C-alpha cells in the first residue's frame, strides 16, 4: 500500500487509548450483543435526557424563521459572540464581579474552549489536575505536546501535576504538596466526585496560584447545582482576576448537550509573565480558529437568561437533583460508602478493594446499568465508580431497584 | 500590576498583526464614526446577505420544536456527526468517488476544521500555501508552531512553501519550483482569486505530492460556483484517495455563515509514513477537541441535501453569480485588469502602482464601500483588491454606480 512521507504527530502516538466516553459507549454496545433483549438502563456517560423547557426551543424555532426574511437574516456573527448574549451572560451570572460584557467569549461549549486555551497556552507550558478529574484537561494536554509519556507502573502522563482528591482530604488537594505549574485546571462542582470547593478552599487556591504566578482555569459547568453556601464562580474570591479564568456551558442547564453553547471568562488583569494580557491571545485564537457559535443556539441562550428561562433551568436542575437524592439514599442504605450528590448530578459510590472496570463490568453484566469507572477519571479515581443522575424518573427508580436486588448480601 | 510567571505562547507574539477580517470590520466600524449617516456597503467581508430558504428554516425550527418533546429530545450527538447527515454528504457530493460515510466528518464549520486538522498534523509538519489564499491556513499554521518569524523584506513567515499564482501563470502555481513541504493546503476555486484548478492541473497537484509524499488538504468551500467543466472535489482526480483529504461547508451554499455547518472528508488509504490512517487521529481529536455539530445545524444541513434544499442553495448560488457579472463589468469598463468571478463570488481587481492597503482606505473614505485589500491574502496579494459579490441587488448596483463615478474621469 501507498505511504505518505508524512510523520504521525509523536503527541497522538503517546495517547494511552482512545478516548473515555466513546469506549463506554462501546462495552455497551458488546454488552447488548451478548445480552440481545437486555433492557439497558444509561447512568454512565452524562447526558441529558429531559425535554429543553418551551421557552427555550420557542425562542430557537423563532431565529430559524427569522433567518429566512429579509429582515431577520444574518450572516457571520463576531467570533466572540453577539453582543446582548455576552451582556446578559457577564450581568447574570458575575453581576458585581467585576466582569464586563467583553471579558466574555461565546462558545459552541466547553469542551470545544478546553482545547482553544490549551492551543493559546501551547505546547511549553505544565499543567496541574485533580486526580480524578474529566479527562478532556488531560487528554489535551497529551495532544498539545505538554506532557511525556504514559507511565503504566503510577497510570499517570509524565510532567502532569495530579492533585489527589481522597475522602481523607475532603476532595479538596493538599495544596502544601503540590508542585508548582504554569496552569491549574480546576473543576468545582467537580466532575467525577461531585465535591464543591468552600470559599475557604477557592481562597486557598487563588492564594497558591498567586504565590506560584499559575493559571487558574476553572470549570464551572455545574456550578448552578450548588446546594451547599459555597461559591459558585471563582471570581467571588477577591484576587481571582489576577490569576483565574472560568469555562461554563448551557449543557447541563438547558439540556444543550447537542445544541451546543457555553462561554469562557477571561479578565482584564490576567497577565503572563512579560505583561501582556490572556484575553488578548484568545481573542486572537478564537477569531482565527473559530467562526463563532450557531445563531440559533445563541438566540435560545440569550432566553435561557430571562425570568422564564431562569425558572425553567432551575426546574430541570431540580429534577435531576431529586434523581441524585433517589441514588445517594439506594447506596447509602446499601452501606456503601457514597460521596457527591450534594451539589452536583453525579454519585462517586467508593468500591474498596475492587478495580472499578471490573466494578463497570460486574454492574453492567448482572444489572444492565452502564454507570462509569473511577480509573477512566485518572489513577485517584481507581476503587470508585460515578454513577450519573440523568434520567427519565422511572429509569433512576429501575436502576435503583436493580442495585438494591444486586448488592443485598453486600 | 501583578503579572503571573506563565510565559506567554511564543508561537502566538510570531503573529504579524491580527486576523484579517475583524481589522476590516474595525476599519469599517471606525469610518462609521468619522461619519456615522454614511450609506456604507459591505463588498469586503465574504458574508452571504440573502434569507435562507424555507425549507431548510423550517426543518431547523422543526427539530428546536422537537427538542421540546420526550421523542424528539435528543443530547449528545456522535462527535463525528449524525449517520444520515454523513451518508447524505457522502452520496450528493461524493457519489462514486469511493467515499464511505464513516470518511465524512461533520463540523461546525471549514474554519474550525482547519484549525483542529493543524493540531492533529502538530508542530513538526512543514506546509505549502497558495499565495495568495485565505490567511486561516498560514495564521493556524504559526498558531500550532509550524513556522519562524514573520520576514518584513518579503512579507512572509518563515518555513512556509508560499505557491506563486499569477495572472500570468493562469493563478496555478509552477510545480516545479515548488518544494517539499508534508503539507499543501490548496484552495480551488481560490480565495481570493476567484481561480479554478483544471483537471489537468489537478492531476499535476496529485502527482507532485504522491511523489514528494505529501498531503493535500483540498478546501472546496466555493466549488457549487464552478461555471467551467472544472472537477468539484480532488477526489475525481485517480490516486488522491492516497495524498489528499477535502473540506467544506455550508456557509457559502445555503447563507449558513451563522448557523455554522461543514465537513471534512478523510479517505481510508491516506497513510502516515509509519501506516498509521490519518483519519483514525483526526477522529481522536474530533472525540477529544469537540463535542458535535449543532443538532438543529445538522437537522438544516440534512434539509439541504434533498431536491428542494438543492433547488434552493442553486437558486441562491445563481444569484450571487449575477452580482459577480455586473461587478466584473463593471471594472472592464473602467479599463482595470479584472480576474476571477466566473467560478466564484470574488472579483479580484488590479490596482497597479498602488498599496492594496491605500486603494481601500480611498475606496472606503470616498464611496464608503469595503473591499478587501489583497495583501490581506499573502505578498502575492499586493497590488490587488478583492471585491466580494455577496450582497443585495440594489446594493452591488449602487456600489457598481460608485466605482463607475469615482473612477470614470481617471481610468
Ligand atoms: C466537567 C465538564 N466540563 C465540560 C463538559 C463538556 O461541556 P460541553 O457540553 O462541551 O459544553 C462536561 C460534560 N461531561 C459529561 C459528558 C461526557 C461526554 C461528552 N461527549 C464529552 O466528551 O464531554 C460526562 O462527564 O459524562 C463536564 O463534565
Ligand atoms: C476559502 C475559505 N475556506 C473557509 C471559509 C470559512 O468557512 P466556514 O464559514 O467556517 O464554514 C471561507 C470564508 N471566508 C470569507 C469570510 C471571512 C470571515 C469569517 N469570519 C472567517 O474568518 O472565515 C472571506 O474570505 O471573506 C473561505 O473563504
Redesign the interface.
Same mark, same amino acid.
Given at each position: 500500500?501507498?505511504?505518505?512521507?508524512?510523520? %504521525?504527530?509523536?503527541?497522538?502516538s503517546k @495517547?494511552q487509548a482512545?478516548?473515555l466516553?466513546?469506549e463506554i459507549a462501546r462495552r455497551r454496545s458488546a454488552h447488548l450483543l451478548k445480552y440481545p433483549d437486555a433492557q439497558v438502563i444509561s447512568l454512565g456517560?452524562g447526558?441529558?435526557?429531559?425535554?429543553?423547557?418551551?421557552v427555550?426551543?420557542?425562542a430557537?424555532?423563532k431565529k430559524?424563521?427569522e @433567518?429566512?426574511?429579509?429582515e431577520?437574516?444574518?450572516?457571520?456573527?463576531?467570533?466572540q459572540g453577539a453582543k446582548p448574549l455576552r451582556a446578559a451572560i457577564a450581568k447574570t451570572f458575575y453581576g458585581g464581579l467585576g466582569i464586563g460584557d467583553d471579558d466574555v467569549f461565546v462558545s459552541?461549549?466547553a469542551?470545544?474552549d478546553?482545547?482553544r486555551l490549551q492551543?493559546?497556552?501551547?505546547?511549553?507550558?505544565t499543567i496541574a489536575v485533580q486526580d480524578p478529574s474529566y479527562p478532556?484537561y488531560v487528554?489535551?494536554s497529551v495532544?498539545?505536546?505538554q506532557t511525556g509519556q504514559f507511565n503504566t507502573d503510577v497510570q499517570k502522563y509524565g510532567n502532569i501535576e495530579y492533585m489527589r482528591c481522597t475522602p481523607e482530604n475532603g476532595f479538596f488537594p493538599d495544596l502544601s504538596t503540590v508542585g508548582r505549574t504554569?496552569?491549574i485546571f480546576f473543576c468545582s462542582p467537580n466532575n467525577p466526585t461531585g465535591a464543591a470547593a468552600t470559599r475557604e478552599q477557592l481562597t486557598q487556591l487563588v492564594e497558591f496560584?498567586?504565590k506560584?504566578?499559575?493559571?487558574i482555569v476553572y470549570d464551572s459547568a455545574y456550578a448552578m447545582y450548588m446546594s451547599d453556601d459555597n461559591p459558585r464562580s471563582i471570581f467571588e474570591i477577591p484576587g481571582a482576576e489576577?490569576?483565574a479564568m472560568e469555562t461554563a456551558s448551557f449543557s447541563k442547564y438547558a439540556?444543550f448537550?447537542?445544541?451546543?453553547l457555553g462561554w469562557t471568562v477571561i479578565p482584564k488583569? @490576567? @497577565?503572563?509573565?512579560?505583561?501582556?494580557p490572556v484575553a488578548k491571545?484568545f481573542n %486572537?485564537?478564537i477569531?482565527?480558529?473559530?467562526?463563532?457559535?450557531?445563531?440559533?443556539?445563541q438566540a435560545?441562550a440569550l432566553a435561557c437568561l430571562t425570568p422564564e428561562g431562569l425558572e425553567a433551568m432551575h426546574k430541570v436542575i431540580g429534577f435531576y437533583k431529586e434523581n441524585t437524592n433517589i441514588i445517594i439514599d439506594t447506596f447509602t442504605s446499601l452501606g456503601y460508602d457514597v460521596y457527591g450528590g450534594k451539589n452536583a448530578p453525579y454519585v462517586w459510590v467508593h468500591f474498596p478493594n475492587q478495580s472499578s472496570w471490573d466494578v463497570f463490568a460486574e454492574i453492567l453484566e448482572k444489572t444492565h446499568v452502564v454507570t462509569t469507572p473511577g480509573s477512566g477519571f485518572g489513577p485517584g479515581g481507581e476503587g470508585f465508580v460515578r454513577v450519573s443522575a440523568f434520567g427519565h424518573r422511572e429509569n433512576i427508580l429501575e436502576a435503583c431497584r436493580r442495585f438494591k436486588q444486586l448488592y443485598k448480601h453486600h
Open positions: 500500500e501507498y505511504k505518505t512521507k508524512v510523520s %504521525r504527530n509523536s503527541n497522538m @495517547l482512545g478516548y466516553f466513546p456517560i447526558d441529558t435526557t429531559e425535554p429543553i423547557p418551551e427555550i426551543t420557542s430557537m424555532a430559524a424563521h @433567518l429566512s426574511t429579509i431577520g437574516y444574518s450572516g457571520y456573527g463576531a467570533e459552541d461549549g469542551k470545544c478546553i482545547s492551543v493559546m497556552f501551547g505546547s511549553n507550558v478532556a487528554d489535551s495532544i498539545m505536546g504554569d496552569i496560584a498567586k506560584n504566578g499559575s493559571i489576577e490569576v439540556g448537550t447537542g445544541v451546543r488583569k @490576567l @497577565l503572563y509573565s512579560d505583561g501582556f491571545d %486572537r485564537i477569531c482565527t480558529c473559530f467562526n463563532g457559535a450557531s445563531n440559533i443556539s435560545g
